[PDB]
Design a protein around this ligand. Structure first.
Ligand SMILES: [Zn+2]
Length: 258
């Protein structure tokens, strides 16, 4: 029926409704650190999030998205392997039922507790919907989360989850600064891939940061209290909303560092 992460509608079933699931540039992938090519021609990333305007947080049934005003160049990503300016539209996480799983990308087969995705679209395309139909339409920054010390800048997000517990619920979420979610270093790996949920379009330049951020056990616990279902429906905890690694096929992962 409709896709999700259960036994009956999980990733292994997606290809029946979205044949691109078995495409040549699907994500996530395992990053083999010893086969990644250092590319000295890659520039440092440029993250300009000082004018970011968050608007709302929403439970869409598969994750929770924090949405930003993208009507102007207020929070942009440029540099790195990118040509042009990419505007931040939303961020969301992928997480597990246990601390040993949850990320979508893996590093030398190592899984992290969760993975943050900052989604950006190429302004040359005018809007998000046009951007996803182009091979260079989106840029996603992926940040791994490990359990350890609490991340102060994540607490405002954690605290509002009770108010969007079920699918379709939303809450005003203004003045949130996404700079509190970045690691200290911007060293990254990059490869051409796709969205990791249906429609799985192959329109993403992935930028995966090498350095994970730490979150406390209590913070990740609060993620696991959300629901996949809508209000008044049988409760299904929102956990394990990650797609397993896909074949690299004809692709090369490049590193910005050595
Ligand atoms: Zn994602």
């Amino acid at each position: 029926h409709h896709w999700g992460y259960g036994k009956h509608n999980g990733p292994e079933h997606w290809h029946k409704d979205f044949p691109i699931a078995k495409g040549e540039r699907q994500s996530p992938v395992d990053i083999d650190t010893h086969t990644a090519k250092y590319d000295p021609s890659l520039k440092p990333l440029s993250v300009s999030y000082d004018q970011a305007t968050s608007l709302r947080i929403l439970n869409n049934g598969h994750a929770f998205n924090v949405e930003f005003d993208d009507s102007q160049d207020k929070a942009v990503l440029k540099g790195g392997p990118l040509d042009g300016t990419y505007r931040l539209i939303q961020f969301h996480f992928h997480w597990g039922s246990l601390d040993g799983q949850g990320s979508e990308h893996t590093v030398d087969k190592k899984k992290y507790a969760a993975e943050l995705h900052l989604v950006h679209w190429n302004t040359k395309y005018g809007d998000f919907g046009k951007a996803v139909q182009q091979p260079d339409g989106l840029a996603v920054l992926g940040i791994f989360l490990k359990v350890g010390s609490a991340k102060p800048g994540l607490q405002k997000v954690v605290d509002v989850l009770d108010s969007i517990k079920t699918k379709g619920k939303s809450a005003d979420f203004t003045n949130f600064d996404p700079r509190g979610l970045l690691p200290e270093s911007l060293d990254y790996w990059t490869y051409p891939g796709s969205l990791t949920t249906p429609p799985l379009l192959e329109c993403v330049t992935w930028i995966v940061l090498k350095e994970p951020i730490s979150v406390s056990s209590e913070q990740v616990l609060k993620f696991r209290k959300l629901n996949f279902n809508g209000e008044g429906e049988p409760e299904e905890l929102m956990v394990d909303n990650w797609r397993p690694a896909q074949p690299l096929k004809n692709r090369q992962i490049k590193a910005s560092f050595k």
